[PDB]
Write a protein that binds this ligand. Structure first.
Ligand code: HEM
Ligand SMILES: c1cnc2cc[nH]c2c1
Length: 289
């Protein structure tokens, strides 16, 4: 199964920078969402969940086909809450109806990371919408109640190694868990992209508690929250070494996250030899906007 990137007809860097800007201006405008976290975190989660259905063995799933727009996939229990991200992106899609759905969902994640002061994430266009029967079945996204060996095995399906897993998990600095979406609650209100997930794992006094949905989670007196899968990164000695590395080197963590996140959003896609180079979008702040 081969998915060849096909550039929206006649479009170039400037067209996609205009879409980036419209998403970034809306992120700034719609600041009240989720008790003033804003939409950045949910857009990052959306871009990960539309990409994380990929299976390297048969190239099913993945961001290319924009299949989250179909009911089977937007109703996946693992996607509960992401409808907020989709509704945020709807006026963007209306303004720029030429962008494919996979390009819009993945660019929403890139734009959110950068506007939250994260690394620059190179991004490539050319995902093409595919039909409803290409939508992957539910059940391909990971469970959060599991241990390190589950996480390691899970990510092998996405062709990610230990460093790529630990880097990608640093996005759990952002936003929060919501009991009604996932059965986990808490985590505060953070909307600045930093390496604080790793510092919190190493420095907080974690207690294993049960939440109001009767699921276990790790909580600190300070109000920080880790899922069992997050905590597994300090239980397994190979992950722990990488958590310490990122806790001690902000720049290394940004560069490794950028590479892993781009790879995640590009899994499954064949880029022709003469495809454009990846775009690196300017932030609103860099543009004086
Ligand atoms: C073992 C892998 C993972 C598990 C089990 C997991 C699980 C979860 C759960 C249960 C939530 C809370 C959802 C809610 O209640 O709203 C969440 C939130 C979130 N996740 Fe993950 N995740 C994993 C990996 C990732 C990755 C790879 C990324 C992106 C690079 C990511 C980005 C996020 C973001 C940004 C949030 C906050 C969303 C919000 O504030 O609305 N997750 N994750
Ligand atoms: C997943 C797990 N923990 C937290 C804390 C903030 N956002 C999170 C996402």
């Amino acid at each position: 199964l081969v998915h060849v990137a096909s550039v929206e007809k006649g479009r170039s860097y400037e067209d996609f920078q205009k879409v980036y800007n419209a998403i970034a201006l809306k992120l700034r405008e719609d600041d009240e969402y989720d008790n003033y976290i804003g939409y950045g975190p949910v857009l990052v989660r959306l871009a990960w969940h539309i990409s994380g259905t990929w299976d390297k063995h048969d190239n099913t799933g993945g961001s290319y086909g924009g299949t989250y727009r179909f009911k089977k996939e937007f109703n996946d229990p693992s996607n509960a809450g992401l409808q907020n991200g989709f509704k945020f992106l709807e006026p963007i899609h209306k303004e720029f109806p030429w962008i494919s759905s996979g390009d819009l969902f993945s660019l929403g994640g890139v734009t959110a990371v950068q506007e939250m002061q994260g690394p620059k994430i190179p991004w490539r266009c050319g995902r093409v919408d595919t039909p409803e029967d290409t939508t992957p079945d539910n059940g391909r996204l990971p469970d959060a109640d599991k241990d390190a060996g589950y996480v390691r095995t899970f990510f092998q399906r996405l062709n990610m190694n230990d460093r790529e897993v630990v880097a990608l998990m640093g996005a759990h600095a952002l936003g929060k868990t919501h009991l009604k979406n996932s059965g986990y609650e808490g985590g505060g209100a953070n909307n600045v992209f930093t390496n604080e997930f790793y510092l919190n794992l190493l420095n907080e006094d974690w207690k294993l508690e049960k939440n109001d949905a009767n699921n276990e989670q790790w909580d600190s007196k300070s109000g920080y929250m880790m899922l069992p899968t997050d905590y597994s990164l300090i239980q397994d000695p190979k992950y722990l070494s990488i958590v310490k590395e990122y806790a001690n080197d902000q720049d290394k963590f940004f560069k490794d996250f950028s590479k892993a996140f781009e790879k995640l959003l590009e899994n499954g896609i064949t880029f022709p030899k003469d495809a454009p180079s990846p775009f690196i979008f300017k932030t609103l702040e860099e543009q004086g906007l």
